[PDB]
Amino acid sequence: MKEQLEDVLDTLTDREENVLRLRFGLDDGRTRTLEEVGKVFGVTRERIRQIEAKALRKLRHP
Amino acid sequence: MKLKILDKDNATLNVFHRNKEHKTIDNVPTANLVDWYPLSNAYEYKLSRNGEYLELKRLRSTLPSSYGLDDNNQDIIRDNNHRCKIGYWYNPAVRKDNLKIIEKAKQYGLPIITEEYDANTVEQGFRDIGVIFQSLKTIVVTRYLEGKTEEELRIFNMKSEESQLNEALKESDFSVDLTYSDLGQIYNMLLLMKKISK
């Protein structure tokens, strides 16, 4: 789901999209723990998880 | 705040304005992003009350302060050297901090947005920053394991590499925080470069 994930990212803000790029290793190839990602954003593991959930839900519909 | 790079030369920017309303600004120049676009993950732009300016807003984050805005104080937010007049695409505060970030990236052997680059060199930059992240994750657990040197290391060591890394990161020093902040802004820069060079 490289194209579909991309269409989803287009609907998120810069910040949310980059959370997901980091998470899924879309740029450097390496997936990252919710904790690495949370540290990069200065937010909790849970907030990163909610962003990921929002994206998966968007990924399912269209 | 959503910046879309349409091609090497042209972007659009969509920002919250008021109520439920967003505004989309077209003909956004890609050339100068360093001078305006905040690289910090703790901030984003909103449209000013009158539509002439893009004004900074602090998100809810533990990341360091940038652009002289510690939290949302409209003395600084509304001030001319802290915002970006639309179509002028210059924000002195943002530019100043962006530039520190740039010099740091240059020091780490990463390509930078103010000098020439192409897709290959950006890709190499993402390779190298990935290496930095990984090494960092090794150092973080190393340092946590010293602290925190109790013979209960066995308890920690009952976890997987990921749970260990997670607990160490959770509990780390402010210094480590600063390293991750820096790297996050550099990552944002490399992504702007990737997108421009597509």
From TrEMBL, chain B:
Gene3D superfamilies, alphabetically? 6.10.140.1800
- Where the record annotates domain Gp67 C-terminal, the positions are 98-197
**Which InterPro entries does the entry link to?**
Gp67_C, Gp67_N
Residues covered by the Gp67 N-terminal domain: 11-87
Any one Pfam family here would be G1_gp67_N
**Name of this protein:** ORF067
Native organism: Staphylococcus phage G1
